[PDB]
Design a binder for this molecule. Structure first.
Ligand SMILES: CCCCCCCCCCCCCCCCCC(=O)O[C@@H](COC(=O)CCCCCCCCCCCCCCC)COP(=O)(O)OCCN
Ligand SMILES: CCCCCCCCCCCCCCCCCC(=O)O[C@@H](COC(=O)CCCCCCCCCCCCCCC)COP(=O)(O)OCCN
Ligand SMILES: [Mg+2]
Ligand SMILES: [Mg+2]
Lengths: 590, 590
């Protein structure tokens, strides 16, 4: 509708006045003043011109005429090029604003890069990288740009037309003071009537646009596959057939503009005809002197120039508006798993975890995990075994509180999860992820990410827990070797080794291992678990392992089939029962 | 230096003539013409003004005066504001160019999205996503936004000054002429001197800029890690401390400009003073007439204003230059592993492979692979076993020819691979990668990527071989579900099952498996390898497996220690030897 526009402009205005620093809160006044003086000069230059022509007509000494001429030339210097150009009053402000603009830009940026890191997991696993980056880079340049064309080229221009009608009405004749008024009115009423009839087009451009780029920016973030299967053509072609349909529409909306920018010309044109013709009539009938026909020949032009100038800008102002809209959209989304106000930090003494009839659904259609309850005594290791797709990892994801349960209760150390602050909750737990990703930085700094204070001593010693010390030293330059983006450059298993080294360095109260021996050879896992046995002496540990050679000494064993527990107990007590665990053990060992 | 500018401009100008379609090769002439007419009207308006002032001075009938004024209110309509704005002999050109700025904004896009996909691996595993995207999205607007300010606002302006000096010399006094000439000369000699002094600054801005964004577009790609280990603040801060340095070094290059834009004002100023004083003097000494003063008071103002306007654009015309420079660099590089001239398709008959004393290195510091040779008969399944980091995957990488060798020879089916075209070579081999990635699309289209002409019936039949048909149908919406981005949405092992189904659908001449049973439970591996034994009836296979339970029936077994072959033979022939393979097998079996 035509009201939302208003709401939007209001918001953009809020970012002008700096809020916090007094000094700056002054520059924003002086600047305004210079704006004031220039408006006056605009109505004092034309007048002086009349004088230097009047005197010349009647004749006078070379002396008197001289001083007068100098005056005119001076004032032109202080205001050259009308509104929207250079000069000496104007450009003296563009040198006292550079500072304020750098206080608004920063603030906006460090706000669209904080929110993106507070949103929840569900949203993140569905975004389209391409877009979430385009929006965040062009966005911070929209707000600054517009706030500088709506306070320095629009509002000023408008004020001038008015000052004009006051004059040309109480200092010249009168009728002339009407010809100007009507012109403007029509100019406006021919803009609105047209701007609307165009919006039917601009709207159906943005949508197609954001979908004529996606596919592509997703065939460059997955290079390997587009090579193995030797495509590399199927792709280039598909693009061509999308850069065509988009173009077919922009023509429509890049021609409407030429129409709007031509109809306006006429309205202006007619105005000049009326005025010029009438003025001459009067001077013939001895009512206004010739001199005067010069004033109404300079003031006018210098008052209609601005309108026409905006003609070469309409194109951009549109684009900038669109981008602002998008950014603001994002800053209105809401986090899903929030925190309860008035919450206290967790009290950690032993580390006991208990589940109480938890039911969970992903897409509200089926229950992936349902009716699970277990208890772990402090200082004990629990293991989970089952077929693929049974829901093993969902329990670990839910313990860390990345999602919210629907029913039941989860309690640790006698305290429920839902009322303690997450920030204090996550400081007691460290987990090795299923897949390893490393920053595009050096291996030493990748290892140090567990805690940003330790010196090379601990990094070095902790490097011995995973058995990577004897391997890194053989590398050229030792621990300052590069890793590459996402860690693809390094190798296949030492990514897992450095991940487990990070976790060991962190040394949390409770340790959880999703997969640890996925990529290691059969002669390296043993040593790793032997080293880990000395570290897990007094810490609760949950381990998941498809291979059953690791949980033979597990303190407790659980079997998950389709999210419902099927049996439990130790190793030998499960073997004697002759159940599914015994069947799988026999199948694996013989 | 000051000559590179030359080569640069030459290129940006090699794009203003559609090279192909004829029709278009015409619009580019009529456009040029309209330019001509306008550059004339500019000297036929000031003149008419004088006439309507002379007549008024001496008196005349309302009739005659009337038919004169009309003229000076028509020519104004056609000319418009000036040399950089709207009108009616200008707009009519910006409506016949839209169709030529869309044949130069395509050709230059489907050329920076092709080259990025023919570069080789080394480069790719070392880029910085953040940047490569940017360079390729802002880049296609520079070369289409400068060609429009170097053939419609510069060259035109220059022509006008000259026409002015010709006149004002052979039609008016001829002494004034000198004034104009000198003024312009000085204007230029100041621009050149100042521009260079400034360059020292602009150069040291770009560099810091591209590095104040890296550690920021790389903490939004690897989201998980920035949560597990908490953080989420350590980051926001680092950003702030880098948005400060950049700023401090721009208030330098955003103030130099204000200086350059004030000096120029003075030079222009002086010119007007000289002229006016002189002209007035002559009119006193009876040489010119009042009428004449009016001409030298309108022509000048409309011959200097066009220049000042450029004062408010300098900012952008810099940024655009910088971006063009970068794009060119990318389009100026070179592929690493090219193809020998000529050459022909590979003559495949059976499927034999041979290695002949291959020595190769990665970074010229260490020898990753050295002294490797083997051979496979047409129909078996060689296997490789060894410790981690021994170089198992490098052999597979070197077969596909992603990198290149230093010595030795590689022969397939009797033909060396170094001369045969890679396009024909890579149509006979299909490999499941070590890490599985999926397109952000539906599962059916993702699994159809093996061959684009496949049908639903054969896709459904082939999905049964991997054992996933009985699993997908239980999902809601069946085969039209989403997999998210990169495939993190699906599961932990179903990605691997989908990848192996893709490979089976492709059905190449030679099959290679890096790791297939990494994420599968022990109850599903058997059925899978039994199913895979049926399709390898007449296809050579190479299999890598850390677990030795799937290699017991291998036709040939190799042991790779540190890239040097230690022993070879079958399974029982190696068990009796009592070597390292026997030790590993015992240790695994317990
Ligand atoms: C905070 C105080 C502000 C005081 C002044 C406010 C009013 C300023 C004058 C506005 C006159 C034009 C109003 C009608 C157009 C409004 C929309 C617009 O300007 O840009 C739109 C996009 O339109 C364009 O593509 C062209 C953009 C420029 C059009 C207006 C040009 C400037 C104003 C011209 C008249 C004012 C006098 C001359 C200014 C030289 C943005 O999207 P939208 O509002 O159309 O979307 C929702 C409604 N459909
Ligand atoms: C193909 C035929 C072209 C004919 C005309 C060619 C010459 C046109 C007039 C050029 C006059 C200015 C020459 C000196 C500046 C050249 C550089 C430039 O314009 O922009 C530079 C960046 O400078 C700026 O930031 C300001 C950009 C605008 C400066 C020139 C403004 C337009 C020309 C002004 C004089 C012409 C008459 C008035 C123009 C309306 C781009 O980088 P760089 O060349 O400095 O880097 C290597 C050399 N250091
Ligand atoms: Mg999992
Ligand atoms: Mg490997």
């Amino acid at each position: 509708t035509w009201r939302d526009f208003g709401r939007k402009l209001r918001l953009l205005s809020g970012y002008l006045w700096p809020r916090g620093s007094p000094a700056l809160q002054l520059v924003v006044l002086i600047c305004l003043g210079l704006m004031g003086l220039e408006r006056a000069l605009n109505v004092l230059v034309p007048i002086f011109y009349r004088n230097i022509v009047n005197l010349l007509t009647e004749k006078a000494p070379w002396n008197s005429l001289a001083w007068t001429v100098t005056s005119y030339v001076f004032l032109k210097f202080l205001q050259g090029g009308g509104t929207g150009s250079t000069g000496f009053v104007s450009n003296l402000r563009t040198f006292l604003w550079i500072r304020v603009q750098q206080f608004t830009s920063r603030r906006v940026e460090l706000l669209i890069f904080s929110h993106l890191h507070e949103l929840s997991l569900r949203w993140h696993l569905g975004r389209r990288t391409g877009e979430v980056l385009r929006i965040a880079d062009r966005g911070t340049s929209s707000v600054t740009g517009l706030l500088s064309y709506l306070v320095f080229n629009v509002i000023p221009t408008l004020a001038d037309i008015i000052i004009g009608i006051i004059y040309f009405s109480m200092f010249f004749n009168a009728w002339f003071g009407l010809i100007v008024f009507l012109c403007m009115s029509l100019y406006l009423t021919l803009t609105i009537v047209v701007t609307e009839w165009r919006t039917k087009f601009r709207r159906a451009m943005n949508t197609q646009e954001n979908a004529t780029r996606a596919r592509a920016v997703d065939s460059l973030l997955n290079f390997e596959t587009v090579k193995y299967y030797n495509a590399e053509s199927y792709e280039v072609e598909r693009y061509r057939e999308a850069i065509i349909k988009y173009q077919g529409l922009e023509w429509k909306s890049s021609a409407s503009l030429v129409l709007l920018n031509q109809t306006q010309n006429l309205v202006i044109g007619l105005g000049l005809l009326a005025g010029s013709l009438l003025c001459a009539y009067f001077v013939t009938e001895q009512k206004l002197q010739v001199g005067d026909y010069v004033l109404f020949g300079t003031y006018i032009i210098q008052l209609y120039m601005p309108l026409n100038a905006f003609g070469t800008y309409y194109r951009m102002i549109q684009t900038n508006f669109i981008d602002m809209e998008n950014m603001f959209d994002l800053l209105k989304e809401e986090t899903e798993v929030k925190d309860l106000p008035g919450a206290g930090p967790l009290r950690f003494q032993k580390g006991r975890i208990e589940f109480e009839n938890v039911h969970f659904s992903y897409a509200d259609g089926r229950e992936t995990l349902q009716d699970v309850s277990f208890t772990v005594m402090p200082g004990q290791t629990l293991a989970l075994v089952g077929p693929s797709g049974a829901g093993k990892s969902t329990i670990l994801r839910l313990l860390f509180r990345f999602y919210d349960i629907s029913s039941g209760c989860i309690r640790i150390d006698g305290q429920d999860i839902s009322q303690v602050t997450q920030a204090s909750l996550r400081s007691h737990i460290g987990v090795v992820p299923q897949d390893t990703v490393l920053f595009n930085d050096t291996i030493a700094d990748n290892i140090r990410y567990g805690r940003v204070t330790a010196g090379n001593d601990e990094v070095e010693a902790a490097a011995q827990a995973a058995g990577i010390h004897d391997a890194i030293m053989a590398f050229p330059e030792g621990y300052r070797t590069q890793v590459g983006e996402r860690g693809l450059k390094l190798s296949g298993g030492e990514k897992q080794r450095v991940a487990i080294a990070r976790t060991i360095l962190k040394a949390p109260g409770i340790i959880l291992l999703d997969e640890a021996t996925s990529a290691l050879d059969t002669s390296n896992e043993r040593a790793i678990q032997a080293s880990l046995a000395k570290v897990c002496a007094n810490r609760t540990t949950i381990v998941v392992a498809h291979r059953l050679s690791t949980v033979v000494n597990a303190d407790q064993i659980l079997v998950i089939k389709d999210g419902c527990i099927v049996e439990r107990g130790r190793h030998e007590a499960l073997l004697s029962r002759g159940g599914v665990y015994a069947d799988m053990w026999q199948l694996q060992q013989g």
